[PDB]
Structure 1
Amino acid sequence: ISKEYHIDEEVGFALPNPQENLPDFYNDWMFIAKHLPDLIESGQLRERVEKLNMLSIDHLTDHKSQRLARLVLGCITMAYVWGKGHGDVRKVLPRNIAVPYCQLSKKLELPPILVYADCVLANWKKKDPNKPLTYENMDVLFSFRDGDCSKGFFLVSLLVEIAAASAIKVIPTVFKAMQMQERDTLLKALLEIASCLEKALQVFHQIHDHVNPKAFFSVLRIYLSGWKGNPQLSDGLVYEGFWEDPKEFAGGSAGQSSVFQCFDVLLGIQQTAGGGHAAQFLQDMRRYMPPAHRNFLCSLESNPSVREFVLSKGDAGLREAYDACVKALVSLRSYHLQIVTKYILIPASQQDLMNFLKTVRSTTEKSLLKE
């Protein structure tokens, strides 16, 4: 795989070894982000941010320092807008944060809001740089509240992404085998993709250990929400010294994950095609991906479909290997569909989402050939 797509051999679409510290110039930004649970609980967060100074982003050289600052500013922004998470919101992002945020967001071709590539792909570190990438050897860089289970939610999401990312290096073999007409090579490549997607489901099971439902629903769910289609910020958020009027940006979501949209595109599931509402939502989230990953999803679409190759040829061994990749995705979205009921549907009852997810699950399951 070419380098300008920013695909790592080990962590896939995740940022390889994200740096943890900013330069001393931005030490004031760092203090608010590193002590978010304490400043919010104390009720001194919103005025600590208001007393900040205007810091120019010109001293944030290279990619990793910009991705960390975007993670820092994104977390601060979520804490300022939502506050303690009880309904008292702020509709104006002060200039001392709003100006360099959009200014830096323009340099990375990302919207000025905390996205999936921030709080998951760049929000981690190896506790021991010598040991493998296990949950016991990692930790998040920033969290919102005490006991919000953000470390479990983010690290498990990262580990599912890394597990599913080991099948990305197989994608070049799939397209080379098609143009060379190598049935045996294409056969083995598809089986390898399904094997990596089945390991991703096994990693998904870790989430029951590190995330409890009530903490996710009543705490962490608040700070991961955006201001697009949100009644609490009806017309969006004001970015002060950058925009003349409000702006509506969607909150973080795994619809912004390039891995799950890669294999939907590779397998011809065409989750973007259809013109429906769920198809438009996933095409929208592509704008929330880093530009190199946005370009990678688009390059796969320029190739002949893997689905039309297997479909035309009467090869039962090729159809079962293709369906093994499709079935692995259905197994993910089905177990994920149980996850939503445990941490959203059940906690909400004790106090459109469902319709969107099983619309994606239905489109995937209707892409099978044998069943």
Structure 2
Amino acid sequence: SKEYHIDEEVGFALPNPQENLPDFYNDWMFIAKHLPDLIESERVEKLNMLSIDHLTDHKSQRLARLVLGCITMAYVWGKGHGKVLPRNIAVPYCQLSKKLELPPILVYADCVLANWKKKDPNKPLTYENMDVLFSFRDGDCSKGFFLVSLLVEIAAASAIKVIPTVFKAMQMQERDTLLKALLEIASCLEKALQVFHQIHDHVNPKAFFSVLRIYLSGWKGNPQLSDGLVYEGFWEDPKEFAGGSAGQSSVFQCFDVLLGIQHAAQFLQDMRRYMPPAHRNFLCSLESNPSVREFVLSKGDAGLREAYDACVKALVSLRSYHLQIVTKYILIPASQQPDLMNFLKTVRSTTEKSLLK
């Protein structure tokens, strides 16, 4: 559906992202494409300031934001062992973030949604035929963690395209249409769970926790940048922004809203700001529609209740397996080097309490 930038094949992800920028931005593209070699070894501070006026289409500006976002995270965090962004990169990065109405920091819509290519376009969207555009460090497992995340967004697209059928069937008092629409969403959410199983085959817990997780960290409520980060020449004062979480996906928040599932309440709302404007306009168009919960309860129909519940159950399954992934990839590795669980459990609890029975 065109106005909201939801793709029929990949949903919220960006279809066929640009891989190359105009020559004018070669200095950017060289740094971003060589980050593994370049981190172990100043070029950002010796970098001239480029105008953003030569980024003319949407995909170019998304790729440019991805390039500048990966550069910024690597400059701030370095080698990842232990506060001011140079004017000549921050001014174009903040200008390009302002234009696209996103915060000047690496966000899920950059390094997942806009950070993939097909290897051969004549074949389908599977891990074996897919790759990422940018990494941080050799062995960071960027490829696996980004692509498996993206394959979940694609699986979710199968359900999102069913979403006009739900509201049309409510308007037209069509009980049999709405039931099939809910079961199809439920079935697609159940197939998304099977993708989650793929993380184990492409992402290594240690590599994730001690390498990749430092470069997705932001600077809002971070003790290393207690006052935040200074974007030299744009604000004289340092500014806080969060870094990447699963909460920046629209997938997670989208089906809460649809199914009428209502401190963590605060966090998912702010995460929407870190989403593309079209996608936030979509989640709002959703909240303006009649409650699927009020509709299914008001009918007294037990078939409809089971289908609504089929959706809610598929979400609880996902949130449990999510939780189990956090156990393998954060809790256990943290107990090996010499409040995230509370947030996830609370969100899971609110979902489970939304069953009808």
Q: TM (normalized to structure 1)?
A: 0.95
* Aligned counterparts of 1:207 and 1:265: Cα–Cα separation in 2: 27
Deviation at 1:216, TM superposition (A): 0.4
Secondary structure of the residue that 2:223 maps to in structure 1?
coil
Percent identity reads 100
> How far 1:312 sits from its partner (Å)?
1.4
Shift of 1:258: 1.1
CA–CA separation in structure 2 for the residues paired with 1:99 and 1:248: 16
Runs of 4+ aligned residues of structure 1 deviating over 2 Å after TM superposition are none
Is residue 363 from structure 1 mapped to residue 355 from structure 2 by the alignment?
Answer: no
Hey, what's the Cα distance between the residues in 2 that align with 1:48 and 1:197? 45
Aligned-partner Cα distance in 2 for 1:343–1:245: 36
The aligned counterpart of 2:53 is 58
Residue 93 of structure 2: SS of its match in structure 1? helix
**Residue in structure 2 matched with residue 238 of structure 1 by the alignment:** 230
Query: d(CA) in 2 for partners of 1:155 and 1:207?
Result: 9
Structure 1 residue 259, shift from structure 2 partner? 1.7
Q: Deviations over 1:227-285 (max 9, x none)?
A: 0000000010000011110000000112111122111000000xxxxxxx100000000
Cα RMSD, aligned residues only = 0.6
Partner of 1:24: 23
**TM-superposed deviation, 1:362:** 0.3
CA shift for structure 1 position 348: 0.3
Task: For residue 227 of structure 2, give the secondary structure of its aligned residue in structure 1.
Answer: coil
Q: How far apart in 2 are the matches of 1:58 and 1:216?
A: 37
Deviations 1:34-64 (A, max 9, x none): 000100012xxxx011111110000011100
Q: Aligned equivalents of 1:329 and 1:165: distance in 2?
A: 15
Counterpart of 2:187 in structure 1 is: 195
- Quick one: distance in 2 between partners of 1:225 and 1:260? 20
Q: For residue 345 of structure 1, report the CA deviation from its aligned partner.
A: 0.3
Give the CA deviation at 1:150. Answer: 0.8
- Which SS does the other structure have where 1:242 is aligned? coil
The Cα of 1:220 is off from its aligned counterpart by 0.5
Instruction: Kindly state the Cα deviation for residue 353 of structure 1 after the two structures are TM-superposed.
Output: 0.4
The 2-side partners of 1:54 and 1:335 are apart by 45
Give the total of aligned pairs.
355
Deviation (angstroms), 1:225? 0.2
Q: Deviations along 1:278-313, whole A, 9 cap, x unmatched?
A: 000000000000000000000011111001100111
Partner of 2:285: 299
Distance in 2 separating the partners of 1:257 and 1:33: 23
Aligned equivalent of 2:162: 170
Measured in 2, the distance between the counterparts of 1:241 and 1:68 equals 23
Q: Output the CA distance in 1 between the equivalents of 2:107 and 2:63.
A: 13
CA positional deviation for 1:138: 0.4
In structure 1, the partner of 2:150 is 158
1:126: how far off?
0.4
Following the alignment from structure 1 to structure 2, what is the Cα–Cα distance between the partners of residues 50 and 129? 38
TM-score by length of 2: 0.99
Per the TM alignment, residue 65 of structure 1 is displaced from its structure 2 partner at its CA by 0.1
